[PDB]
Each structure stands twice: as structure tokens, then as C-alpha cells.
Structure 1
Amino acid sequence: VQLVESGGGLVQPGGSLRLSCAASGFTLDNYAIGWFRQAPGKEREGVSCIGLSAVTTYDTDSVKGRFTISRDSARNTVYLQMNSLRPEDTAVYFCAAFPYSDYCPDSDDFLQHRGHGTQVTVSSAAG
């Protein structure tokens, strides 16, 4: 109920990195977690959302078929798995929690408990 995003920073096009949203507050069993991303110049987008019932939903068509959200309650952590990354995906990713819920609020909504996000970009990644 106090969140950190760990995960990872930038990758190459076609890459894959897993983002990890973990609680440092209290039990995330009773909450829905959504990942959103905010581009350096565009509106927030819902990326994916996992509910209380461990049901999942994907909110933006631009990312469907690539992104996956999953949970492991042993560690109060949800993971967002990225796959086949493209420059269109470079953004600050962050997660937020909503109580006793299976579904996430609109990306436009004031979000209740977000963490400081993770900057993820897609590029050459070496000399």
C-alpha cells in the first residue's frame, strides 16, 4: 500500500524486460494493480490491469499481444512482462493500486496509490 517500481530502464528494439511493482506498505491481496505509462509528450495510457480475483484486462490496443500482467502474492508483487518492444513504447511506467477491485479507473482519473515510476526507453543500448 506504499509502492515501488523496480523492473528495468532502457532496452533495444525487439527486447523484453519485466517491470515489477511491489508493496512496502500493507497487503496487496485486496487490490487491483494497474500499469500506466506516461510519454514525454503524450497522455497517460492504461497498459494493463490485474484485479483482486487475479483476472486481467488490457486497456490500450497499441500494446495488446505484447504486454502481460501477472501476480505472485507471496511477495506482494505484480509483474508487467514486455515483449517485442518498439520505440513507440518509450515512457515512464508506473503502477497504482485500487482497493477491493477487479478493474482499473480510466488513465485520465486521479489515481489513488501510484509509485514513483520507471523510465523505460527503447534504443541502440551500447557504443
Structure 2
Amino acid sequence: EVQLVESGGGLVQPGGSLRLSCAASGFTLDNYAIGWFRQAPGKEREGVSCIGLSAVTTYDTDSVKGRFTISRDSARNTVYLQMNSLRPEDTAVYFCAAFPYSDYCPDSDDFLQHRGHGTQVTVSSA
């Protein structure tokens, strides 16, 4: 029933910023943590930002701390990822996922039940 749809990705110049959105079209969204994750070719899944059901924010990937910020608009049932100073190493499919009755997001070795299709972010100069 929990449905998540991302938006806001694409081709972006190195150094620039991008804001991703995660639109939640299930309900009782206030009782879920929402995490942003990414998957780059040949790498493990990284949880890059998380906001828990209590609104606490956590950042499980050191290489994006200070550049990424997660926020929740409860009225809109949307979670935003603000990415800054983007690097070639940030190129990945970015996807959001929902975790019922959680304040935190799983580590890479945990399975992931409710997630969106994902949105490509490619950091390069065309």
C-alpha cells in the first residue's frame, strides 16, 4: 500500500546542487522513517540521509555529510533531499524508502521492503 515516487534528478554540472523529492502516496506517513539511498555501478548501496518518525535526522554515509540535507513536509507527504557540491562519485540512482515505526534507516546488509523506482543523478559536464 505504501507507494513512493521520486522526482528531481537528471544531468547536473559538477559542483552544482540538486533537490530530490520523495512523494508518499500511501498513508499514515507520519509513523514511518524515510531514507534516501543511492546505488552506483560496482558499489554497495549507501544510505545517504534519513528522517525518522520522530523527525530526527541521521546521515549514515560520511562522504556526503555536510553536503546532503533531508527534510519532511508532512502536509505534502513529501521528503526532500538537498544535494550540494556534487561530485562525479555522487553519480548514482537515488531512491527513497519507508520504514514503519522506525527512527533510523537500515545499513547496507539489511533488506529493504518499501522503496521507489529511483531517479538517475549523473554528475558530468555535457
After TM superposition, the score normalised by the length of structure 1 is 0.94
> How far apart are the structure 2 equivalents of 1:8 and 1:90?
10
State the shift of 1:23 in Å.
Answer: 1.1
How high is the sequence identity, in percent, across the aligned residues?
A: 99
> How far apart are the structure 2 equivalents of 1:108 and 1:79?
25
1:86-126 per-residue CA deviation (whole Å, 9 max, x = no partner) reads 101000000100011111111221101010000001011xx
Q: Who is 1:35 aligned against?
A: 36
Gaps of at least 5 residues in structure 2 are none
Gaps of at least 5 residues in structure 1 are none
> How far apart are the structure 2 equivalents of 1:83 and 1:119?
16
- 3-state SS of paired residue (1:88): helix
- Following TM superposition, where does structure 1 have runs of at least 4 consecutive aligned residues deviating by more than 3 angstroms? none
Where is the strand percentage greater, Structure 1 or Structure 2?
2
Is the Cα contact below 8 Å between 1:18 and 1:79 reproduced in 2?
Answer: yes
Aligned length: 125
Is the Cα contact below 8 Å between 1:51 and 1:103 reproduced in 2?
Answer: yes
> How far apart are the structure 2 equivalents of 1:78 and 1:107?
21
Is the Cα contact below 8 Å between 1:36 and 1:107 reproduced in 2?
Answer: no
1:29-60 per-residue CA deviation (whole Å, 9 max, x = no partner) reads 11000111000221101101000011100001
After TM superposition, the score normalised by the length of structure 2 is 0.95
State the shift of 1:27 in Å.
Answer: 3.0
Is the Cα contact below 8 Å between 1:47 and 1:58 reproduced in 2?
Answer: yes
> How far apart are the structure 2 equivalents of 1:58 and 1:26?
25
